[PDB]
Amino acid sequence: MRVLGIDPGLANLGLGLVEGDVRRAKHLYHVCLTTESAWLMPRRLQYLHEELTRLLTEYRPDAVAIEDQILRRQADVAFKVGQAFGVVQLACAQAGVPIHAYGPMQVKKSLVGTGRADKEQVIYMVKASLGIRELFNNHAADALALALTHLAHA
Amino acid sequence: MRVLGIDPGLANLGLGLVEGDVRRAKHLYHVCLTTESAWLMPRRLQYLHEELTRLLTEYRPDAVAIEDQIQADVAFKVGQAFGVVQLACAQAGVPIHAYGPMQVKKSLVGTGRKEQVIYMVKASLGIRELFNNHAADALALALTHLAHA
C-alpha cells in the first residue's frame, strides 16, 4: 500500500510518501511546500493545489492520511488554514484518492506505542521505521508519521 | 463589464452573472448550488469547484464579486468552501473583489442602511421571480461591483 501523508497548512504544507504494510515500510519522498504572505491568498492556494496535484499524478498513492487537529484559538487563522485544507481535500478527490484522518494521539500511539509521546519521540520512530538518517523539517516528518499511521491502521 | 457574484457556502453556493455598468445591467444567469452532509467533505468541495469552474469557463467574466467574511472550527469549515471558490477564480485568471453587506445595501438601495435589496435586484435585471436568497445575494454582489467600478 502506497500512502501520502499530509501535514496541512497554508504557509507550510508537509507531504510524505511511504509504501508498505503494518510490518515494513519504505520511504519514497518527502517535502515541505511553502507559500508567501506577500502572495495573495488565491495564488497561495493555486500554488499548493498545483504542486499537490503534480505529486498525486506522479506517485499514484492508494490513500491519503491527513492530520485531524483540534487546534482552537483564532478564528482569523482558522479561516485561512481552512482554505488551504479545502484545496488539499479537493486535489485528493480530483485524483480519486480516499482521505483518512488521524488525530495526533492516534499518530503517537501507532508510532511510539503511547498517546502522550513527545514530537521528538515520534520523529525518532519515523526515521527508524524508514531508515532516514536525518529529518530537518518537522512538517515533512509529521507528514511521514501520518502515512506510517495509516499503514498501522490498515 | 461582466461580473460573477458569489454568495459563498458549503450547503448552498449562490452564483449570479450580470453584465453592464452602473446605469444599466443585463441578467445572464443565476443558480444556487447545493451539497448535502450525506457526501464526504472532499466530494462536496469537488462538486462545488467543478460547477463553479464550468460557469467561469463558459461565461468568461471580467471580475468576481464575493461576500466579505465579516467560532474557530466554524471559521475553519467556512474557509474550506471559500478556499475552493478562490482557487477556481485564480485558475480562471479572474480577479476577486469582496464586498460587505452594508456596501451591497448602499449600492443597490437608496437607504444604504433584504426585501429592499431583492426588489432592487429584480428591478435592475427585469427578473419577475427570484425565490432563492443565495442566488439573489449573488446577483446583488455582482450589481454592487458594477456600482463600484
Overview of this structure, please?
Two copies of one chain form a homodimer. By secondary structure, chain A is of the alpha/beta class. The first copy, chain A, is 49% helix and 22% strand. Chain A has five helices and five strands, in the order βββαβαβααα. A five-stranded mixed sheet of chain A has the order 3-2-1-4-5. In chain A, β2 and β3 form a beta hairpin. In chain A, α3 (104-112) packs across α4, α3 (104-112) packs across α5 and α4 packs across α5 (138-153). At the A-B interface, α1 and α2 of A face α1 and α2 of B. The PDB classes it as dna binding protein. Keywords: nuclease, DNA repair, Homologous recombination. It forms a dimeric assembly. Crystal structure of RuvC from Deinococcus radiodurans.
* Major sheet characteristics of chain A: 5 strands, mixed
Output the radius of gyration of chain A.
Answer: 15 Å
The helicity of chain A comes to: 40-55%
**Shape of chain A, please?**
globular
The string of secondary-structure elements of chain A, in order, is: EEEHEHEHHH
Question: How large a portion of the residues of chain A is in β-strands, by DSSP E?
Answer: 15-25%
Strand order of the largest sheet of chain A: 3-2-1-4-5
* Oligomeric state of this protein: homodimer
Structural classification of chain A? alpha/beta
Number of E-state strands of chain A: 5
Secondary structure tally, helices of chain A: 5
Q: Could you tell me which chain pair has the largest interface and how many residues each side has?
A: A-B, 29 and 28 residues
- Domain count of chain A: 1
Terminal-residue CA separation of chain A? 9 Å
